[PDB]
Symmetry: none
Subunit: 374 residues, 2 copies
């Protein structure tokens, strides 16, 4: 295990660095700001110490690197000069667990860290150094995919609501299944709901509803008891429904035909909108949002999926050709760069759909320059 | 010292409860769900412990309150009945500083919490900063506007870069000055740069010397030292310049003449259009974008600010008249309705400029309809 890193140009802070050398905990020292950003990106859950003993490196950028997205995937800690806690001490808005004095109790500082080192060690123990497999990562396997799957795993088991966002057709629904597998209630039911349509009619009938609900029915919430329910594009939801949703997340009760009984469901949500505007405009509920935004997961788009683009193609054909008895089996080296350059607004689904349409057209074994433009 | 709160039916949780009582902590035990939320609201900075001995607590609801709004105003702590490879063990995601066994380790218990004692006093120190009548709300008093004031408040102290956006002439510069006044660096200077029509020229001299004579130049950042630099409508900025901008967002240094000095500036930016289009086009750098989009605040338009329009008019009349004496005083209940119907593409800015001229045109004490079109 190497999950320990501090950042400063002052690599002479011996009053507390070799104390980890001798105790057998080692170190990882950064001097710049651009470097640890990428570092903290690839290290995941770890312990990081910021030496702000006036060692010459910003403050606006400090709070940035800490909260760029290094929130849950990093337990913050800081070192400051003994006489420096006056002005912008508000940096502990990012409650960096604890600060650091100069009168080193070369034995007590470990009590601060060891209780937080062990605090971290539990996560890395039960499943150390992972970044692949998991049923072939369900979809892809690139570099942001590595980060993704590591986030998923550590946020999986936690039966709190997680906010899934990313471009449309990125596979937000796929991820919802992934965390469910880790949520230990995998065997228990799962329901993905396309909320783009629904309208106030059917949407209400699945919690209470008009005097309709033509017998049986059994609301999805009831049917997802112990399992998992997904809500794609929750932003689209009518206000009166976001209400009924909020009642459940406090009560957990639904009105059925044979009784307004209560159920246990872990709730997931999907979004594609700018959400910040909807909050302001009041289009979507704020309190509900705080019930949802407890955990956020960043679903990558066509940012850096170049290594996935080439792989995402190979699987679909293997899954699509065999399914529809095709002769096409391989791609051309021309089509390679062409697909990588493509922006894919629909991302996966588009790359999933476009490939599907090509198969039923191509009468050859290898695909060419053909109208992949559309 | 008054920081103590427990949440559970800790009837038989005596082996570790009064041991803190007589040592000085001033506790307050809750048992329900809604009550502690109200409690933690009125307790402010304190240390609260959650008993998760598999009793009666919605795992989902738990993590919420932790990060519902009990962030800086509360430090989380947890008590478990010795659980191992469970979903509950993954709760460290909620940065719960340290765990808690059932067999109390005597007077060793104190040090775990004791490390956070100094962490709590600091919180309560900078914790107040209450709004002097909310500073008159600065602008308006509706519902999207209200949520905004709560939003601008919580993101204020956070000396991070924030992407402010909304329609044109909605007061993005206004918002920027608010958080600057909200930050701990309020007394520090402030730089709002309304660029656009600058041409790739001064931005150079804004980062280095352009002559060799004497001096004759002193860039904005140094003048924003400790303070805040704003760039109204950024995305339009030429490519070669966001680079050096990023350089400051990484290094924080700038050439002058009397030294290639480094400066501490919290930078904010503004956009009215959509950086979205620029990203796909590759027009705007993505690496810098993430440095900017650390926090988003959406400035509402006429979206649901119709109820504020009448106040914005009432206000401007009161300040434009007295500025130029004028005879206009009462608007009439007729010309009011007509102003609501108008779309106001420029929103505030149009209402700002237009009202000024009308006063300078109206010969009456109470204007009726008049022109008011454009």
């Amino acid at each position: 295990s190497v999950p320990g890193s501090l950042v400063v140009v002052g690599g002479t802070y011996e009053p507390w660095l070799p104390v980890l050398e001798k105790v057998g905990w080692r170190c990882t020292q950064v001097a710049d700001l651009r470097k640890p950003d990428a570092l903290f990106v690839e290290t995941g859950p770890c312990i990081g110490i910021v030496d702000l003993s006036h060692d010459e490196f910003s403050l606006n950028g400090i709070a940035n690197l800490v909260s760029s997205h290094k929130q849950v995937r990093w337990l913050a800690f800081i070192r400051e000069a003994q006489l420096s806690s006056d002005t912008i001490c508000q940096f502990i808005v990012n409650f960096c667990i604890d600060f650091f004095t100069a009168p080193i109790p070369d034995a007590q500082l470990l009590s601060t860290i060891g209780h937080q080192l062990g605090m971290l060690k539990l996560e890395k123990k039960v499943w150390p150094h992972f970044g692949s497999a998991g049923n072939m990562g369900l979809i892809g396997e690139s570099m942001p995919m590595k980060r993704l799957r590591d986030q998923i795993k550590r946020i999986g088991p936690t039966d709190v609501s997680i906010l899934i966002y990313g471009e449309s057709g990125t596979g937000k629904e796929t991820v919802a299944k992934a965390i469910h597998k880790t949520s230990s209630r995998a065997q228990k039911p799962f329901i993905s709901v396309n909320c783009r349509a629904m309208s106030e009619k059917r949407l209400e009938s699945e919690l209470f509803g008009l005097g309709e609900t033509e017998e049986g029915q059994q609301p999805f919430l009831l049917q997802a008891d112990g399992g998992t329910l997904l809500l794609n594009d929750i932003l689209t939801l009518p206000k009166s429904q976001q209400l009924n949703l909020l009642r459940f997340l406090q009560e957990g009760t639904v009105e059925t035909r044979q009784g307004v009984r209560a159920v246990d469901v872990r709730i997931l949500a999907a979004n594609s909108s700018d959400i910040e505007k909807a909050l302001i405009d009041g289009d979507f509920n704020e309190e509900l949002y705080h019930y949802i935004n407890v955990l956020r997961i960043n679903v990558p788009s066509l940012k850096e999926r170049a290594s996935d683009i080439v792989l995402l193609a190979k699987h679909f054909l293997q899954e699509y050709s065999k399914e529809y008895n095709a002769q096409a089996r391989s791609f051309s080296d021309d089509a390679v760069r062409g697909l990588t350059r493509y922006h894919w607004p629909g991302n996966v689904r588009e790359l999933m759909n476009q490939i599907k349409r090509v198969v039923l057209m191509s009468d050859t074994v290898v695909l060419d320059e053909s109208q992949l433009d559309l």
